[PDB]
Amino acid sequence: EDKITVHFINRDGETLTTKGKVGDSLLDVVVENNLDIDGFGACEGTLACSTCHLIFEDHIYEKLDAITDEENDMLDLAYGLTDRSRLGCQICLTKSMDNMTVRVPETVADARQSIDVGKTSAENLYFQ
Amino acid sequence: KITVHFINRDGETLTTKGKVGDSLLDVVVENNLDIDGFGACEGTLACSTCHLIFEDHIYEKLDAITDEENDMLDLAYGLTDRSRLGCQICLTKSMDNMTVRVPETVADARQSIDVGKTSAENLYFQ
Ligand code: FES
Ligand code: FES
Ligand SMILES: [K+]
Ligand SMILES: [K+]
Numbered sequence: 660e661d662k663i664t665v666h667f668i669n670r671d672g673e674t675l676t677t678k679g680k681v682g683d684s685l686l687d688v689v690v691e692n693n694l695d696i697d698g699f700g701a702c703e704g705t706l707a708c709s710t711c712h713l714i715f716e717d718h719i720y721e722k723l724d725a726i727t728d729e730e731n732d733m734l735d736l737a738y739g740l741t742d743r744s745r746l747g748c749q750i751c752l753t754k755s756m757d758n759m760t761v762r763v764p765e766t767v768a769d770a771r772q773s774i775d776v777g778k779t780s781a782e783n784l785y786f787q
Numbered sequence: 788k789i790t791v792h793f794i795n796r797d798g799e800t801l802t803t804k805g806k807v808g809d810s811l812l813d814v815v816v817e818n819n820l821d822i823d824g825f826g827a828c829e830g831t832l833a834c835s836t837c838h839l840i841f842e843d844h845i846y847e848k849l850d851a852i853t854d855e856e857n858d859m860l861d862l863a864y865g866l867t868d869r870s871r872l873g874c875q876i877c878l879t880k881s882m883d884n885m886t887v888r889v890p891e892t893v894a895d896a897r898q899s900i901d902v903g904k905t906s907a908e909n910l911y912f913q
């Protein structure tokens with residue numbers, strides 16, 4: 660089976676070009692080529708995190724396998740979910756993906772300006 | 788067996804009992820507490836779904852957070868200064884009758900899905 664080219668736009672805004680085998684997941688591509696993306700693929704592709712979140716080009720997105728309920732559950736928890744988002748670890752390379760660009764979106768940690776004040780209730784100590 | 792109170796996302800209190808040494812994920816799971824989606828990664832420090840909020844005094848004396856826990860706790864939605872990952876917090880006799888809260892998920896917070904863009908341009912400057 661042949662190899663194809665995939666471009667990644669990093670959170671940094673830097674473009675990484677790499678080559679992946681047809682049939683490999685985009686997570687596999689990130690890992691097997693040791694790309695500079697921090698935090699990506701925490702659950703190691705077992706549909707238990709949202710860290711493999713990627714954004715796809717219009718015409719690639721349109722052609723992706725229908726999203727399973729399982730994926731959708733975890734995709735709902737992706738930070739900054741878009742109408743071109745999928746979990747990269749469920750998306751397998753096809754020949755028609757050659758020279759596509761996917762973007763790695765920012766995490767909740769990148770956007771967070773402050774840590775909230777934690778609280779178990781609004782209840783006044785006097786009452787409690 | 789010690790008693791823990793969970794304040795659910797609905798605002799409702801669930802009271803349940805856990806063995807010493809069990810994690811709070813353990814407790815949630817073993818007693819089938821209706822908490823949607825809590826502990827996806829089954830306690831392998833690979834999600835943020837076991838996020839819980841603790842009382843001041845309990846929080847302070849919890850086991851020192853590890854880097855592994857902290858990397859994932861950074862990815863929790865609505866991180867608080869009283870937040871930890873429940874799958875890493877084990878019951879002690881001293882925790883009997885404490886209260887924790889389950890914070891809302893990003894999906895609960897969400898009012899709409901955004902427009903996806905691989906990238907932007909301001910061709911006003913071509
Ligand atoms: S790696 Fe965890 S869901 Fe894709
Ligand atoms: S259960 Fe996934 S990290 Fe706690
Ligand atoms: K905040
Ligand atoms: K939105």
